[PDB]
């Protein structure tokens, strides 16, 4: 005689709920798998890659259950520009009597510590092995900088391929090669379309996929047939994620930083502004233990041009009002997870795609903006993403002086001009600010066929720093 809502509240209470994070715990002892961290933040970032019009977000909603907005009326159907964020909790069940493959269970961010076992007849409770975040990268030919930024923030990969379509999909190859560029060898291949398939056709496509991945960097990548609409083979992907992907080294010794990819103004309309909030920047902490009430500055920040034409950068200092992660407001942030840093920053500053690929540093560190940067570049033999109708995939030409090139350092989408080209190094001038922290893997893309085309990889070697104006 109980409502579903009263029920859910009951088994949420019986599951231990969602405990509040402590104000000040012992950080020298915390691991990304402490029960304190896993319940209220994601420690592993997983990205999704695939061909256009494939349904990457559909697999994400099958796994977690949180939608990816898909906004802007026009972009409600075709393609979205920003990333796709959803939170999944990997619940294993402690009873070994039930079969291992259906033990694993992925649930939304709102799930409890120990909710009951949905399998009929099993009295076990789920234990949360890890909370993970999901980034749905774009899948189109024009949007490339956001994809590469997502790959840079990615820690694990999920490749999606459809079966009955043509076997050599070049968008998938471009995604995998870009993931290879930014030091990611943890990829799980996913066969999206298996229901409308024959027994021999699936085997032939599997053979084709296995033949495809022989000469690339990634060798031992698993392949899983999942159904995005039928909502099955969900536990298999979760157990594969648990097994093959370990934790990249990210501890508390490394200095704190932030890399903002998305911005979120907080200006709830219609109500009086006497009750208002700040402005949220969606950024990832690849290194750093950030807490509530800390000083931070956006390194490239305010971009201005004087009467002489010189580019001036005013780093945007700001006091962190709040940090948003997982579901509840959290006191201290765990590196290895997208976080909304909600600060006293201006409402307009976070309005549009403005804080897309910028570098932010806490008070107590000085990242350097650079105006001219020396890069060490390497490049492939043929472009990926060009469907040649039976003729020798376009072979890439060597770079030329005075060429506009889209250079993605980390997450920043900058247009560099070539000053010098050499055998294995090059010199780039940035009309848009970029900053150099430590190593910061880079990707290079050219204008060859109308739209952007990835060519190779690069690393920052030298540069001409610009001292910020106080």
């Amino acid at each position: 005689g109980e409502t579903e809502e009263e029920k859910r509240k009951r088994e949420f209470e019986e599951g231990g709920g969602l405990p509040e994070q402590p104000l000040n715990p012992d950080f020298s002892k915390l691991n990304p798998l402490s029960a304190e961290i896993i319940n209220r933040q994601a420690t592993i970032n997983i990205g999704t890659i695939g061909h256009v019009a494939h349904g990457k977000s559909t697999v994400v909603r099958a796994i977690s259950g949180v939608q990816t907005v898909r906004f802007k009326d026009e972009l409600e159907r075709n393609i979205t520009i920003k990333l796709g964020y959803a939170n999944a909790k990997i619940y294993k069940c402690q009873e070994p009597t039930c079969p291992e493959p259906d033990c694993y269970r992925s649930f939304k961010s709102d799930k409890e510590i120990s909710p009951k076992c949905q399998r009929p007849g099993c009295p076990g409770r789920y234990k949360l092995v890890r909370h993970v975040s999901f980034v749905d990268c774009p899948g189109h030919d024009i949007l490339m900088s956001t994809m590469l930024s997502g790959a840079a923030v990615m820690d694990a990969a999920l490749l999606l391929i459809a079966g009955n379509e043509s076997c050599p999909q070049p968008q998938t190859s471009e995604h995998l090669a870009a993931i290879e560029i930014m030091k990611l060898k943890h990829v799980i291949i996913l066969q999206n379309k298996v229901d409308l398939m024959r027994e021999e056709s699936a085997l032939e496509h599997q053979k084709s996929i296995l033949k495809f991945i022989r000469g690339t960097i990634a060798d031992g990548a698993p392949i899983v047939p999942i159904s995005a609409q039928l909502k099955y083979n969900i536990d298999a992907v979760n157990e594969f994620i648990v097994k093959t992907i370990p934790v990249p080294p990210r501890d508390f010794m490394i200095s704190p930083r932030l890399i903002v990819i998305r911005s979120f103004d907080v200006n709830k309309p219609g109500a009086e502004i006497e009750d208002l909030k700040g402005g949220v920047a969606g950024g990832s902490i690849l290194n750093g233990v950030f807490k509530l009430g800390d000083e931070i500055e956006i390194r490239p920040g305010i971009v201005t041009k004087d009467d002489k034409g010189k580019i001036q950068c005013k780093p945007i200092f700001s006091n962190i009002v709040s940090l948003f992660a997982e579901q509840n407001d959290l006191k201290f942030a765990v590196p290895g997870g997208l976080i909304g840093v909600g600060t006293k920053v201006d409402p307009t500053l976070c309005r549009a795609d403005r804080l897309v690929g910028q570098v932010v540093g806490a008070k107590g560190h000085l990242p350097n903006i650079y105006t001219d940067i020396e890069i060490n570049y390497f490049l492939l033999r043929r472009l990926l993403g060009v469907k040649t109708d039976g003729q020798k995939q376009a072979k890439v030409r060597k770079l030329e002086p005075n060429e506009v090139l889209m250079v993605n350092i980390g997450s920043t989408a900058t247009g560099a001009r070539v000053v010098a080209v050499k055998a294995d190094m090059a010199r780039l001038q940035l009309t848009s600010p970029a900053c150099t922290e430590i190593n910061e893997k880079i990707a290079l893309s050219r204008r060859i066929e109308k739209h952007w085309r990835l060519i190779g990889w690069a690393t920052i070697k030298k540069g001409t720093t610009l001292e910020p104006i106080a």
Binding site: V194, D195, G220, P225, N233
Partner: peptide, 23 residues
């Protein structure tokens, strides 16, 4: 090695024939 791929594949086909006999 993609041997643990075809087992899930046959599992999916079996559920396909279980749920949708008309297909």
């Amino acid at each position: 090695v993609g041997l643990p791929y075809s087992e899930l594949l046959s599992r999916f086909f079996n559920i396909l024939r279980t749920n949708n006999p008309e297909l």
